[PDB]
Design a protein around this ligand. Structure first.
Ligand SMILES: NC(=O)c1ccc[n+]([C@@H]2O[C@H](COP(=O)([O-])OP(=O)(O)OC[C@H]3O[C@@H](n4cnc5c(N)ncnc54)[C@H](O)[C@@H]3O)[C@@H](O)[C@H]2O)c1
Ligand SMILES: NC(=O)c1ccc[n+]([C@@H]2O[C@H](COP(=O)([O-])OP(=O)(O)OC[C@H]3O[C@@H](n4cnc5c(N)ncnc54)[C@H](O)[C@@H]3O)[C@@H](O)[C@H]2O)c1
Ligand SMILES: [Ca+2]
Ligand SMILES: [Ca+2]
Ligand SMILES: [Ca+2]
Ligand SMILES: [Ca+2]
Ligand SMILES: [Cl-]
Ligand SMILES: [Cl-]
Ligand SMILES: [Cl-]
Ligand SMILES: [Cl-]
Ligand SMILES: [Cl-]
Ligand SMILES: [Cl-]
Ligand SMILES: [Cl-]
Ligand SMILES: [Cl-]
Ligand SMILES: [Fe+3]
Ligand SMILES: [Fe+3]
Lengths: 362, 362
């Protein structure tokens, strides 16, 4: 009773080293130099290929023996892609790299987390989708966001589309060893993507604050994160880039000690079955969940108006029942998320009938 | 210019593992068990002796071969005390312990940090007062607050009164490997101590937010910390114990990426020379620094009224000039703090004349 409650609290592993500041990408070489202990040590840089022909590519401090892979996140990470990148690293050099760097958004960061894991753990990444399935430590890995809002930089998961579902590699080993938060690097994100990924953060906060998993640690982080989001998207603050990077991080810290909810549940269906990306998919879901998060949706609708956002509509209106069934099956399987939303007895409330009504309104 | 600014940002090492929740002290045994790799491994528990005859002593999970030291913080930590505790550990067992636990307030936590360091670094702790002087990693160490507000649980320093001054062992190695934040443990702190240590947190926030070292990372933490303090001390919130623990932590994270200021500067003089403890000494200083922090002092004066706090007065009114000179010398030597307050050209503003006027009003 009293003992069992005390033992229940999560021992949260967070990112132990962080650099925050505009221009701080310049420190990556010095950071990596502390990991290079031999002449023949190498680093893997996984760089979102949006950067491949941009000035940021030329700033990547790769040595002649390092491996730079410009990764394609036009579709979100899959277990097939993680396995293919991991095979690439092994074919390039059988020696473990001394670090794996993820330079990009949530997709690229999650690829770097997953590759850093699959280098020291056998089999397909599909065998590790779930909770605490990883038994060997990852290779040292570094997260450098070039889009802000997912909180992927701060979290203990790496979300992948596998054979059966979208589900993350949840493990203390997944957590980045180092992150660099340089808001100069988010400069050229298109406005709509900036908005959608930023709303991922906003929606994290709302779902955490409504949920049954909440404690004061998650609550302090989620409230300040949500306030920073307001400064970014409502107040048009001049330091909105640094502010959005802090919101993202604090939002990740929040979820890490709580849980996401109904909007993420639904979004994962749209994402797995129809291929909608996470930022926009969350927003699509959120716009039909006003009964769940009345104030959040109202505020988000106001943010959309300011930023000229028109969500695509009638995505699911004329789709076959078979395709809707697949989305409902994926969303229903997210137990912890619906537990957060509803509490004990959530199985009886989250029916196929109700989820189907939601998806048909998207 | 642009490169030198990018390189200037601190690579912040924070506490990598945290448990937050009421009753979570019960997990300490399981946590320590992960560090015990032999039958003959031992742990040092440094326990604030306020707990020695209280029920919390009986909950400490010491094995027969472990060392429990009930430490006396009636005076704040000195280099002599750190050296004496370190000698005690070495005389008890020449083998390094697998962890050093600090169960107490800021004083006890700083003792545990310092001992964990001096076990692997030669000489007196006085030789390490300063910045980045520690060259060998500390023994694994765990922080468990039983008074909330210093932020000692989150910081990279351990503040000691040495031969010459109050100055900390500032180093990435100083940082706790693990903290447990169980607000049941702060239950029996007397009201005035609860207020004074809590105002340490409040004052951290104010000094950080006024300063020239501020960035958005320190700013987000300090603002939310300050809001939590208001919930605790103005709103009388029912979850004030968990809230104050979060404020303390977030306040420590803030200072860690910024700096304290004029109030801490002055407080360190009162502390070193006259022996005033840190919480009450800060409040004494703050009450004469209204020109520096007008809004902070006003709000703190209001908090004092609610909590029936009457600061002792005329402490310095009738003291010899020689004794005031000593306090001014210590306060003036805090360069980074006055740099935070004033910026470049602080040496010309922080004169003996001005500091002497302040101290005479305390
Ligand atoms: N690991 C976690 O804890 C966690 C949490 C939430 C979401 N996620 C995952 O994050 C992924 C989405 O990440 P995201 O929303 O950051 O988007 P993303 O990484 O998928 O990138 C979105 C688009 O922005 C582009 N882009 C990135 N940086 C840019 C730059 N500076 N300039 C111009 N364009 C740039 C990319 O090339 C891409 O086309 C999803 O797969 C989602 O599941 C992970
Ligand atoms: N390391 C850092 O980053 C940092 C930052 C700020 C201050 N400090 C240091 O922290 C020290 C002050 O710490 P503090 O303000 O927490 O006070 P403290 O640790 O000195 O303890 C204050 C008093 O409270 C008592 N106490 C502790 N727990 C109690 C409990 N649960 N019930 C009843 N009484 C209890 C103690 O026995 C003591 O008498 C100073 O030496 C200061 O320099 C360190
Ligand atoms: Ca390509
Ligand atoms: Ca593309
Ligand atoms: Ca004693
Ligand atoms: Ca005593
Ligand atoms: Cl790829
Ligand atoms: Cl996941
Ligand atoms: Cl655009
Ligand atoms: Cl809401
Ligand atoms: Cl002692
Ligand atoms: Cl110090
Ligand atoms: Cl009392
Ligand atoms: Cl002020
Ligand atoms: Fe998300
Ligand atoms: Fe302090």
């Amino acid at each position: 009773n009293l003992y069992f409650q005390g033992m229940s609290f999560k021992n949260f592993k967070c990112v132990p080293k962080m650099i925050f500041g505009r221009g701080s990408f310049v420190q990556l070489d010095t950071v990596l130099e502390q990991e290079r202990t031999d002449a023949n040590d190498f680093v893997v840089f996984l760089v979102d290929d949006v950067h491949q022909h941009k000035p940021l590519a030329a700033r990547v401090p790769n040595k002649a023996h390092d491996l730079v892979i410009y990764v394609n996140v036009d579709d979100e990470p899959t277990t097939v892609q993680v396995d293919e990148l991991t095979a690439q690293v092994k074919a390039f050099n059988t020696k473990l790299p001394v670090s794996v760097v993820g330079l990009g958004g949530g997709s690229t960061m999650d690829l770097a987390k997953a590759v850093s894991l699959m280098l020291t753990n056998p089999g397909s990444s599909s065998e590790y989708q779930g909770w605490d399935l990883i038994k060997n430590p990852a290779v040292h890995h570094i997260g450098i966001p070039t889009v802000s809002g997912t909180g992927a930089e701060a979290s203990r998961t790496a979300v992948l589309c596998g054979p059966v579902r979208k589900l993350g590699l949840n493990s203390d080993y997944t957590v980045f060893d180092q992150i660099i938060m340089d808001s100069e690097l988010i400069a050229g994100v298109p406005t709509d993507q900036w908005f959608y990924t930023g709303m991922d953060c906003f929606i994290h906060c709302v779902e955490s604050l409504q949920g049954t998993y909440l404690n004061e640690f998650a609550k302090a982080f989620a409230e300040k994160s949500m306030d920073l989001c307001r400064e970014v998207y409502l107040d048009d603050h001049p330091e909105k880039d640094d502010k959005l990077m802090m919101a993202s991080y604090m939002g990740g810290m929040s979820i890490a000690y709580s849980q996401v909810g109904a909007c993420h549940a639904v979004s994962y269906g749209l994402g797995y079955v129809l291929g909608y990306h996470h930022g926009i998919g969350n927003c699509l879901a959120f716009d039909v969940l006003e009964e769940f998060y009345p104030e959040g949706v109202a505020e988000f609708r106001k943010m959309m108006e300011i930023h000229n956002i028109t969500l695509p509509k009638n995505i699911c209106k004329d789709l076959p029942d078979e395709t809707i069934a697949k989305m409902v099956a994926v969303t229903k399987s997210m137990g912890p998320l619906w537990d957060n939303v509803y509490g004990k007895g959530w199985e009886e409330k989250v029916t196929d009938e109700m989820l189907t009504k939601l998806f048909r309104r998207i």
